[PDB]
Design a binder for this molecule. Sequence first.
Ligand code: GSH
Ligand code: GSH
Lengths: 244, 232
Amino acid sequence: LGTENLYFQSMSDLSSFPITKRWPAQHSDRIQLYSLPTPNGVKVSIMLEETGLPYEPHAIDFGKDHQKTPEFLSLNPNGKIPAIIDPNGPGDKPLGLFESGAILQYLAEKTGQFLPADPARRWQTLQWLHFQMGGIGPMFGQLGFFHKFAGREYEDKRPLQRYVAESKRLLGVLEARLDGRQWIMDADYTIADIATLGWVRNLIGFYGARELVAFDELTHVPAWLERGLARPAVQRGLEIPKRP
Amino acid sequence: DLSSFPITKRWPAQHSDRIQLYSLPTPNGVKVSIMLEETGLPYEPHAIDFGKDHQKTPEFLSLNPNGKIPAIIDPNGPGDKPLGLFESGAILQYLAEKTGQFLPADPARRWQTLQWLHFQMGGIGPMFGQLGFFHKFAGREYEDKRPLQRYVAESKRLLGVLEARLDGRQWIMDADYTIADIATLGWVRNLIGFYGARELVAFDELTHVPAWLERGLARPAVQRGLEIPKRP
Ligand SMILES: N[C@@H](CCC(=O)N[C@@H](CS)C(=O)NCC(=O)O)C(=O)O
Ligand SMILES: N[C@@H](CCC(=O)N[C@@H](CS)C(=O)NCC(=O)O)C(=O)O
């Protein structure tokens, strides 16, 4: 039975995941994070920092098309960051996950942190998560393409006007929700805030759209953003992994 | 005791002991109607007339302040109290929990199913919808087609991810039909039907996504849910 015990150990380390051939794990007993500090990547590094889970971060170099490599694609077939491998997954077996949304939900369940205990407020929290994932992320990103990236050279500005109006409309929904609340779920800081902070920060910072979306006419979203940014875990998460 | 929910002032419940669905048979609305049909849960659907801006009334906004469909109220929510929910994704997860169905048994496979859910919610829906805007709706009038070309390319790329995933699988999660399939089928149907983009995205060059769609559309609950509620 020496062979059989080696077999059971093999299913608990990470050599069965082909991504590790390109980004080797130094700490096979820690969550492997494959990411960049983009608005989507930082959701997960922030969550990991807020939970105190040990992890090992790996920058994925998009300049070299490393997200298009067979090794990266074996974990996320969509070719995007973030992705993780949790060696201590359900049933003490390693689990790979892509999609920031699935990962945030996974880490909140794993740790019993950043999701209300109350069943109704838990469901409510997931609506706001889904709101960021289907609305905020994709729409702010389209604004970015037409304002900051290659879409900015297109002469017809109606696309740009469309994503500016939708980004402002989304911010207005946040603004009514944060009127009289500390966090999206009131006194509880949750994966809904962790999903959303980076995108708002990015919109008014890197994207250079602060005036474009009339951000400084808002009251409640700016104060909420300031609250999130004062959290040490947010400050840490925002710069992990270092850019390659 | 739904009286506390102001939406019922504009869309009264004839059956306050049943889930109230506020929706339209759009690619996002059909996710929830299909789920409800697949589960067999009693519910009472209400068409929300966008032609009359009804989704921007105080009554609708009290349930979804984002002013979109679908939305539900379950009178027999957690703690035998009513729960309002918006977002098709959150509703699918809630209904899967309510019924113990359309998620895999295995916890690892459950989290994997939620990946494909989120890939749909963050990728398929928003991108296919932008293609809709520039090919089917008002954006079709813009002479310069670079925006359209962008969303055609992204939608094809998304279909390419599904095509590789479905290669040798019956459903997205292998032998398990789940909320991942329920979330995605309507968007793919709509893309090649109502949006008129079947040739634009080179759909008939694919093998696995077309086969998967046919298997989904052969299900009676999908056929029922695709047309509920009836358009106002
Ligand atoms: N939807 C995914 C990631 C989506 C996404 O677009 N991520 C970006 C960075 S913010 C990326 O990987 N971009 C690379 C590419 O599009 O090739 C999530 O929320 O986890
Ligand atoms: N992320 C949402 C999106 C819902 C959505 O965009 N719904 C459309 C129908 S496909 C709508 O209600 N539009 C209303 C409006 O644009 O005001 C979900 O999946 O539920």
